[PDB]
Write an enzyme that holds these catalytic residues in place. Structure first.
Site, PDB file in Angstrom:
ATOM      1  N   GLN A  24       0.810  -1.213   0.000  1.00  0.00           N
ATOM      2  CA  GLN A  24       0.000   0.000   0.000  1.00  0.00           C
ATOM      3  C   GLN A  24       0.847   1.270   0.000  1.00  0.00           C
ATOM      4  O   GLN A  24       0.343   2.349  -0.323  1.00  0.00           O
ATOM      5  CB  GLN A  24      -0.937   0.017   1.201  1.00  0.00           C
ATOM      6  CG  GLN A  24      -0.248   0.293   2.516  1.00  0.00           C
ATOM      7  CD  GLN A  24      -1.227   0.360   3.665  1.00  0.00           C
ATOM      8  OE1 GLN A  24      -2.190   1.131   3.633  1.00  0.00           O
ATOM      9  NE2 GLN A  24      -0.991  -0.451   4.689  1.00  0.00           N
ATOM     10  N   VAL A  27       6.768   0.094  -3.401  1.00  0.00           N
ATOM     11  CA  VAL A  27       7.664  -1.021  -3.661  1.00  0.00           C
ATOM     12  C   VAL A  27       8.555  -1.345  -2.472  1.00  0.00           C
ATOM     13  O   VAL A  27       8.963  -0.462  -1.718  1.00  0.00           O
ATOM     14  CB  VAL A  27       8.566  -0.724  -4.876  1.00  0.00           C
ATOM     15  CG1 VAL A  27       7.735  -0.609  -6.145  1.00  0.00           C
ATOM     16  CG2 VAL A  27       9.365   0.545  -4.648  1.00  0.00           C
ATOM     17  N   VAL A  28       8.847  -2.630  -2.319  1.00  0.00           N
ATOM     18  CA  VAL A  28       9.819  -3.088  -1.344  1.00  0.00           C
ATOM     19  C   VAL A  28      10.903  -3.855  -2.085  1.00  0.00           C
ATOM     20  O   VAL A  28      10.612  -4.662  -2.973  1.00  0.00           O
ATOM     21  CB  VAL A  28       9.185  -3.984  -0.271  1.00  0.00           C
ATOM     22  CG1 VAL A  28      10.238  -4.441   0.712  1.00  0.00           C
ATOM     23  CG2 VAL A  28       8.071  -3.247   0.445  1.00  0.00           C
ATOM     24  N   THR A  86      14.500  -2.149   7.007  1.00  0.00           N
ATOM     25  CA  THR A  86      14.238  -3.154   8.032  1.00  0.00           C
ATOM     26  C   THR A  86      14.985  -4.449   7.799  1.00  0.00           C
ATOM     27  O   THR A  86      15.612  -4.681   6.757  1.00  0.00           O
ATOM     28  CB  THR A  86      12.730  -3.506   8.163  1.00  0.00           C
ATOM     29  OG1 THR A  86      12.335  -4.382   7.098  1.00  0.00           O
ATOM     30  CG2 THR A  86      11.865  -2.273   8.139  1.00  0.00           C
ATOM     31  N   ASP A 133      -2.797  -3.576  13.705  1.00  0.00           N
ATOM     32  CA  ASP A 133      -3.228  -4.304  12.508  1.00  0.00           C
ATOM     33  C   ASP A 133      -2.567  -5.678  12.436  1.00  0.00           C
ATOM     34  O   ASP A 133      -1.990  -6.071  11.424  1.00  0.00           O
ATOM     35  CB  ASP A 133      -2.912  -3.490  11.242  1.00  0.00           C
ATOM     36  CG  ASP A 133      -3.589  -4.036   9.994  1.00  0.00           C
ATOM     37  OD1 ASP A 133      -4.537  -4.830  10.104  1.00  0.00           O
ATOM     38  OD2 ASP A 133      -3.143  -3.651   8.894  1.00  0.00           O
ATOM     39  N   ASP A 151       5.652  -4.261  10.828  1.00  0.00           N
ATOM     40  CA  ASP A 151       4.789  -3.087  10.613  1.00  0.00           C
ATOM     41  C   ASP A 151       3.919  -2.739  11.806  1.00  0.00           C
ATOM     42  O   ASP A 151       2.826  -2.171  11.650  1.00  0.00           O
ATOM     43  CB  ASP A 151       3.953  -3.256   9.331  1.00  0.00           C
ATOM     44  CG  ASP A 151       4.777  -3.134   8.077  1.00  0.00           C
ATOM     45  OD1 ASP A 151       5.959  -2.753   8.166  1.00  0.00           O
ATOM     46  OD2 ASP A 151       4.219  -3.401   6.995  1.00  0.00           O
TER      47      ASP A 151
END
Ligand SMILES: *CCC(=O)Nc1cccc(Nc2nc(Nc3ccc(Oc4ccnc(C(=O)NC)c4)cc3)ncc2F)c1
Length: 271
Positions: A24, A27-28, A86, A133, A151
């Protein structure tokens, strides 16, 4: 060095190696930091995040350190898009991992995944930090098969209102307790509820909770006191644990410390 705080990574230290996906925020990528250390690099799409608020919170997230939490290494914010750096998790998203039938998981492996997540959540709870979440789609799996929670808290900084309230078309209705759906009452106990649903996701090998219902229908179902039921792979003792997370009264739900003790007991009894 000069020009960078403790929470800030110099993007020039990154080597990009592979695209991992698009979420959302955009890009990762997988890459290396200073030529040697594996990292995931999240490139935050312009306009998707409350960036100043996130950056201040990143300072807090930096000090969350637990083996079952996906570690935040720092942010790259001199720029756009900004990057979140991360821990890299070679086996990807837990939801996808669960759905790969080749793994032929034993139930002891599934319970260990639950314990991994419960340890992370017990840690966050000890720091009075809510995930907000929790779900399989927000857990990752490393090359040793260890599940970690990712997250944590990040939903607070999402600008797309479709995600941000029960009024929204992309809100995690299926992981929300009645008091969240009815009144927007978030608490430790809404994380507890979500954890029970995650346990259900794990034991169901990644089925969508309430798979035959819409979100609307799910909210109705839940508010009428009805619940998910026992996955085929869950023993009665495991089902008792996940079901305990779904008490209509939030204060009757366990803590993560209690859930962890319950999971350890079942492991011992089922080993
Ligand atoms: C379930 C939600 C989800 O998919 N989330 C998500 C996707 C990508 C990255 C990300 N953050 C993230 N990922 C990783 N590692 C990692 C490893 C493998 C992997 O799987 C994969 C990679 C590339 N291509 C495919 C594919 O199916 N191509 C057709 C699959 C994804 C991610 N480490 C750390 C992170 F923060 C979350």
């Amino acid at each position: 060095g000069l020009g960078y705080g403790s929470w800030e990574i110099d993007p020039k230290d990154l080597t990009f190696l592979k695209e991992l996906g698009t979420g959302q925020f955009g890009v990762v990528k997988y890459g290396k930091w200073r030529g040697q250390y594996d990292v995931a690099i999240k490139m935050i799409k312009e306009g998707s995040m409350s960036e100043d608020e996130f950056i201040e919170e990143a300072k807090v997230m930096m000090n969350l350190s637990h083996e079952k939490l996906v570690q935040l290494y720092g942010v790259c914010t001199k720029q756009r898009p900004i990057f979140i750096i991360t821990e890299y998790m070679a086996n990807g998203c837990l939801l996808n991992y669960l759905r790969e039938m080749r793994h032929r998981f034993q139930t002891q492996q599934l319970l260990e995944m639950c314990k991994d997540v419960c340890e992370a959540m017990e840690y966050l709870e000890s720091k009075q930090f809510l995930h907000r979440d929790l779900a399989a789609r927000n857990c990752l799996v490393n090359d040793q098969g260890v599940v970690k929670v990712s997250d944590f808290g990040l939903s607070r900084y999402v600008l797309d209102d479709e995600y941000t309230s029960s009024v929204g078309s992309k809100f995690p209705v299926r992981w929300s307790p009645p008091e969240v759906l009815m009144y927007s009452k978030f608490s430790s106990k809404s994380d507890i509820w979500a954890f029970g649903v995650l346990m259900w996701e794990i034991y169901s090998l990644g089925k969508m909770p309430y798979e035959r219902f819409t979100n609307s229908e799910t909210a109705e179902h839940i508010a009428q006191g009805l619940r998910l039921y026992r996955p085929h792979l869950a023993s009665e003792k495991v089902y008792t644990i996940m079901y305990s997370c779904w008490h209509e009264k939030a204060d009757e739900r366990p803590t993560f410390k209690i859930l962890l003790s319950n999971i350890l007991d079942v492991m011992d009894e089922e080993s």
